[PDB]
Ligand binder design. Structure first.
Ligand code: HEM
Ligand code: HEM
Ligand SMILES: Cc1cc(N)nc(CCc2cncc([C@H](CN)Cc3cc(C)cc(N)n3)c2)c1
Ligand SMILES: Cc1cc(N)nc(CCc2cncc([C@H](CN)Cc3cc(C)cc(N)n3)c2)c1
Ligand SMILES: C[C@H](O)[C@H](O)[C@H]1CNc2nc(N)[nH]c(=O)c2N1
Ligand SMILES: C[C@H](O)[C@H](O)[C@H]1CNc2nc(N)[nH]c(=O)c2N1
Ligand SMILES: [Zn+2]
Lengths: 407, 411
């Protein structure tokens, strides 16, 4: 019931009590751990509302006050009559910030209270969605001095009128399977690109074509919009020492912005809620560039470095990996686009954990995602025991809409 | 039931049924995952089902389930348990059990090897001196002048828990650590507490950076006794770098034989509290953890200094660059001296093939991702992208507390 987490580098032990407030299920049982699996009515709603409103009124030091009891009363009345309820602005803001605070896979949460919340609940059409999203993109980008933001579209009603952004991120590159058998662009995005073309997009057919948005308002068929090119800040990738690096023709975008997740606050479901921060360098340099199923660039880079690729034991993959990651960080920093390295981010997270343990009684953290995909044990998070559990408000994965949607 | 694991690089999906045979707990519940927690005297009544599960598993493995041999063995074991409160394994059952505890070790990336294990039966041992001899023989056999062979040496099982065999060393070969009055540590900081124990017990400490610790051995619940492994049996590798001539002057070396000596082997309900086992190293164990952990030899700074890297900001990735060079050096050094070692790319690739084989022939392969993924270059190894299921099968190796925390001193 009361649980200890130990840091094996520093011997610091912290005690977790926050997990007792956990609500949802983990995927694990006493017989099987699923820690490494990527995807493990009126009646239901009033408890969820009450749970949330209690935590909110507690946060503003007015728990069990008349304003507390009056709002619980009001939400209760409203669910009774209408089958749902509407969050106050103060509650929506609190809820969005806490969904981020509770996101166990996010190493960037020291920042959680500084989130700019854009209330797009008054949106009704796909053109409106497009407008809201351009404004989000411009605000968050801020000419390279990035600011965290979320834009929240209307909540689910009967579920036949869902707002969705069909894109997985606001900004992503097209992928095209070629006669050649190879893939041009991002292999992650082949299926979505086909949907875009099939819906009428005219693809430039290059290696870094920013995808159009596919927006679904009010459960209608999604429509296509292109983000103003001038709002998408991109960074050409060069290396501080290797002059040939630029010749690889690599670039990435400045703004990481997840658009396929579902935000749950007080039992209400916000199925379109694009959110953004800034990159940790490894995300681009290790994963986007070096995953065999992605741009898969290790081979080309190692060749330009003139390394012995004959045997795995020469660690050519590892050498080229480091360089690619030095290049990414240098390029963002030179163009003054906000980026964080995995050493600084993980150090920040350890501090955030201590804060959360001290002020909140714990911090749900998923070690499998928090530990960077390179140089794991030379980051402090590797040595830090973490407990993973699900608190609400939360961000949840949801299925790609082309499976749900009836055209 | 059926559980599926996906590999996100290949889209290959595997189906686990083996997890239905799991019994012990994981630490996890439907409300909390403890997948990153390092650490998440039997009665007769408990013992006969444990013996029976094991014997049914053994007899099935030799295609003799339900034979007269199988039935007669169950009867014989049952009678021994009710008569003596315990039982003895046949040599064949002991071998099978030891191999299976390895096959079942979910934190072990080297399991493709599991069926090649030399088992030394040391159940006739009675004294610390006897244990010393057995362990010397294990070291010499496993070392094989650099052509390393996996092995385990199994000392007598637990009886009343007051007569335990234990190796107090956590590994058979490890280096001393000495806390200095000024707060610095000489040698390996992981081994300071044990080093102080050896010293107190009468060890004459050379007080250098790589002093091989003496063995501290407990037989039959007695106070443990000190013994020095003959130095000519302890194979070591001086670490040098293929391109950097100054790497040798760091004065680094490491031992060739990784040999765990503090774990408990459970077979059919019986508990083998002293069961030292050894394989060969994966390079990162030394180059990443032993050399570069802040709490271990902590060489990153010195290496990066010598390399003249920009050390004013982490974003130059100086630590990452030094890290790779050190690991190249370890692999090169072991290879040049013809001492078995495997790189983390080779080891993980073989583990995936092993895992897929097991899913096909066994219905599963319990694996702990947190431990299986290497501590450098995680996602450029195939295991990073492989979903895994962790659960506990027996026979098994288990952690046990250090014996100095529990021992009743006789004086
Ligand atoms: C401000 C700087 C931020 C940093 C440096 C950061 C860092 C990260 C990183 C490295 C990941 C792993 C991404 C991956 O492997 O694909 C992640 C995941 C995540 N973060 Fe953040 N984060 C930031 C801001 C945010 C914000 C603003 C939110 C929400 C408001 C958020 C919620 C999440 C969620 C839900 C995930 C898991 C995503 C998934 O399941 O695919 N983070 N964070
Ligand atoms: C044959 C070559 C082998 C290789 C390359 C290898 C590889 C590894 C590695 C890298 C670890 C993680 C070490 C760490 O982080 O501390 C490990 C853990 C382990 N392996 Fe092996 N292994 C080998 C043989 C063996 C043998 C012979 C056994 C027993 C018969 C064994 C049982 C284990 C166990 C029980 C662990 C978990 C240790 C603990 O919890 O402290 N492995 N293996
Ligand atoms: C807000 C934010 C900040 C930041 N620094 N990075 C991000 C990364 C977003 C992202 C980019 N590319 C891929 C992903 C995820 C996989 N790593 C997508 C994903 C896939 C699956 C199967 C499950 C899941 N939960 N999430 C997430 C978001
Ligand atoms: C048979 C074998 C082969 C191989 N390649 N490597 C090994 C490494 C053994 C080892 C060496 N140094 C430390 C450890 C473990 C953690 N890494 C010790 C440990 C500590 C704790 C707190 C728990 C635990 N289960 N195990 C294990 C053994
Ligand atoms: C199977 C495994 O869970 C999967 O490859 C994970 C591992 N850790 C990760 N960690 C982060 N931050 N992001 C990821 O996409 C993944 N992928
Ligand atoms: C806290 C965390 O579980 C701990 O640092 C683990 C992580 N993964 C590991 N993996 C291996 N192979 N060996 C270890 O000692 C550890 N330590
Ligand atoms: Zn778990």
């Amino acid at each position: 019931r009361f649980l200890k987490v130990k840091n094996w580098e520093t011997d610091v032990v912290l005690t977790d009590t926050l997990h007792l407030k956990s609500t949802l299920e983990t995927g694990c049982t006493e017989h099987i751990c699923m820690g490494s699996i990527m995807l493990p009515t009126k009646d239901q709603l009033f408890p969820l509302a009450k749970e949330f409103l209690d935590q909110y009124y507690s946060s503003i030091k007015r728990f069990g006050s008349k304003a507390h009891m009056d709002r619980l009363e009001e939400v209760n009345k409203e669910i009774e009559s209408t089958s749902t309820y509407q969050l106050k602005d103060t509650e929506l803001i609190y809820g969005a910030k806490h969904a981020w605070r509770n996101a166990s896979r996010c190493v960037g949460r020291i920042q959680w209270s500084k989130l700019q919340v854009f209330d797009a609940r008054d949106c009704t059409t796909a053109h409106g969605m497009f407008n809201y999203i351009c404004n989000h993109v411009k605000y968050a980008t801020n000419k390279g001095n990035l600011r965290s933001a979320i834009t929240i579209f209307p909540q689910r009603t009967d579920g036949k009128h869902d707002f969705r952004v069909w894109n997985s991120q606001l900004i992503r590159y097209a992928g095209y399977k070629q006669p050649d058998g190879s893939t041009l662009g991002d292999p992650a995005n082949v299926q979505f690109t086909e949907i875009c073309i099939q819906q009428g997009w005219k693809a430039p057919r290059g290696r870094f074509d920013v995808l159009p948005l596919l927006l679904q308002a009010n459960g209608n068929d999604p429509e296509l919009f292109q983000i103003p090119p001038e709002l998408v800040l991109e960074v050409p990738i060069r290396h501080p020492k290797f002059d040939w690096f630029k010749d690889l023709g690599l670039k990435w975008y400045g703004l990481p912005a997840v658009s396929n997740m579902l935000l749950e606050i007080g039992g209400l479901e916000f199925s379109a809620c694009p959110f953004s921060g800034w990159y940790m360098g490894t995300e681009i340099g290790v994963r986007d560039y070096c995953d065999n199923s992605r741009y898969n660039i290790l081979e080309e880079v190692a060749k330009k470095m003139d390394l012995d690729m004959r045997k795995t034991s020469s660690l050519w993959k590892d050498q080229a990996l480091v360089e690619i990651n030095i290049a990414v960080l240098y390029s963002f920093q030179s163009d003054k686009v906000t980026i964080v390295d995995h050493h600084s981010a993980t150090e920040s997270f350890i501090k955030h954990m201590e804060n959360e343990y001290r002020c909140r009684g714990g911090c749900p953290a998923d070690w499998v995602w928090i530990v960077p995909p390179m140089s794991g044990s030379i980051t402090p998070v590797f040595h830090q025991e973490m407990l993973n559990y699900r608190l609400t408000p939360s961000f949840e994965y949801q299925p790609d809409p082309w499976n749900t949607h009836v055209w």
